[PDB]
């Protein structure tokens, strides 16, 4: 169907600049108006900007005028949001979206990309295994997991066995520590006999630091 794929999120310093892009497919790119809409924590949804992919003419919400620039590349069906003079208040998930004509409601949305505006450094996580054992086994079900410690900014994603393992997986929200760093964990429950026959690997992605960690979790 229609697809909208964002790239570019991560950490930016106050006053800094960041470029997001949205790759569109599954429709006539020039038949529609393209938008960015953002969702900041605690705050609700805010429309940011729209662009006519034909003329390249753009309209911006008040707080983004002179600061943000929308552009298009017709040849690769891609929209670019160039953000300058960013402030802590611009921390948000940024979505690309689509509307038709003068009706600015959005039937298709991208997946979102989190932009964090902060003076702190990026820091990739330290990943530690949470080993299954008789002590984490109940009624023949063993719990194992990974602890993703001390990273910044959000987000991290976790999969198991490259996405082949999905049932019984619980990946928690992050906690913000006194250190100003985040931590989260993922725990999966599996049959005890599988501890001898199946290898378990947690795949951690921290896109803001360009870090991936594949941690083997061994029974102890």
């Amino acid at each position: 169907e229609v697809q909208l794929v964002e790239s570019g999120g991560g950490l930016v310093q106050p006053g800094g600049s960041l470029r997001l892009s949205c790759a569109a497919s599954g429709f006539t790119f020039t038949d529609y108006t393209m938008d960015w809409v953002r969702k900041a924590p605690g705050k609700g949804l805010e429309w940011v900007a729209d662009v006519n992919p034909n003329s390249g003419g753009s309209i911006y919400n008040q707080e983004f005028k002179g600061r943000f620039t929308l552009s298009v590349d017709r040849s690769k069906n891609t929209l670019y949001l160039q953000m300058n003079s960013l402030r802590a208040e611009d921390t948000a998930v940024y979505y690309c979206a689509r509307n038709l004509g003068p009706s600015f409601y959005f039937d298709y949305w991208g997946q979102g990309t989190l932009v964090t505006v902060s003076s702190a450094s990026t820091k990739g996580p330290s990943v530690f295994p949470l080993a299954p054992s008789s002590k984490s086994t109940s009624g023949g079900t063993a719990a194992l997991g990974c602890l993703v410690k001390d990273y910044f900014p959000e987000p991290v994603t976790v999969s198991w066995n490259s996405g082949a393992l999905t049932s019984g997986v619980a990946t928690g929200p992050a906690v913000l520590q006194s250190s100003g760093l985040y931590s989260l964990s993922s725990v999966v429950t599996v049959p005890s006999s599988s501890l001898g026959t199946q290898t378990y690997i947690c795949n951690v992605n921290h896109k803001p630091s360009n870090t991936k960690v594949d941690k083997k979790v061994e029974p102890k």
Partner: protein
Amino acid sequence: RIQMTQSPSSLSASVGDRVTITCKASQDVSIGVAWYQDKPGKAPKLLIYSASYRYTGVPSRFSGSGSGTDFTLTISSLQPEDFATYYCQQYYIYPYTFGQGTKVEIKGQPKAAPSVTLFPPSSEELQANKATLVCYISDFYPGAVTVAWKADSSPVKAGVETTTPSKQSNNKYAAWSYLSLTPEQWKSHRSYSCQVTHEGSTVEKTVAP
């Protein structure tokens, strides 16, 4: 300039209940109102446009009404999968203001006491001169718990961080609590425990070096 004032902030309702969410526009917007459903980790989904037109695939339990300034989103028979934040939006007048959102939670689902799994510090972490105990709390309903930690028999409050419970399925919650210790503190006690209180009753798990 233009405002969309959505009400209530949140609501909790039982499966099968009729729920209503309202939105007041600060000026006449005819029927140029849309409603969206937003779930954690997912992009907003369009439910309704032109105030009362249901989008492709949206269940008929969702309906919208109103024109001018007063708009209503009605869910006729609340389902577990309807747990989400709903937003109104007016879409003709710049800057196409969204309401502040209404969080819908489900009450009255079957109660379940928590399971508690307590992981000790990994050998890798201890070798990095750090120690964290991880208390994984699962399969509980409703989604409120309190966590207390103990070093041997006595309370420890320093070094604790706990998540707000997150819904894992149409029916159950999970939560995490972490205790940060030095490797010396870990090794010097007989045990540590994580005690979870849920609706006045407790489940406690204990680990030892």
